[PDB]
């Protein structure tokens, strides 16, 4: 898309998207990569930060690091080309 809104919420605004961010975007949050970030990226579309607690297979420690950064986590409209390359978008350091 030429003019895609919510470019900032992907990786760099320090307020991340849920249903469009790469798993590399959750690396900037201490505690979530790779385990807690692995479950968020793997499952389907979310509508809010409250839907992060609906993930099948959460602990109290996995809900803990989500509870820390729940101000920084936010959910947006899933545009389906970003939702595919959420595990790997071909970006490597």
């Amino acid at each position: 898309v030429i003019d895609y809104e919510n470019i900032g919420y992907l990786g760099g605004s320090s307020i991340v998207d849920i249903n469009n961010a790469n798993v590399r975007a959750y690396l900037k949050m201490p505690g979530m990569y790779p385990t807690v970030a692995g479950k968020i990226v793997s499952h389907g579309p979310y509508s809010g930060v409250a839907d992060l607690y609906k993930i099948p297979g959460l602990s109290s420690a996995e809900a803990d690091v989500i509870k820390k950064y729940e101000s920084r986590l936010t959910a947006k409209t899933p545009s389906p080309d970003y939702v595919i390359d959420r595990i790997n978008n071909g970006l490597y350091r």
Binding site: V41, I84, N88
Partner: peptide, 23 residues
Amino acid sequence: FLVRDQRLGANVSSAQGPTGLGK
């Protein structure tokens, strides 16, 4: 990288590659 992204809960068989082939 098959082992790496399998630990992230990703289905690696149905993981559609960027060209349309298997990633």
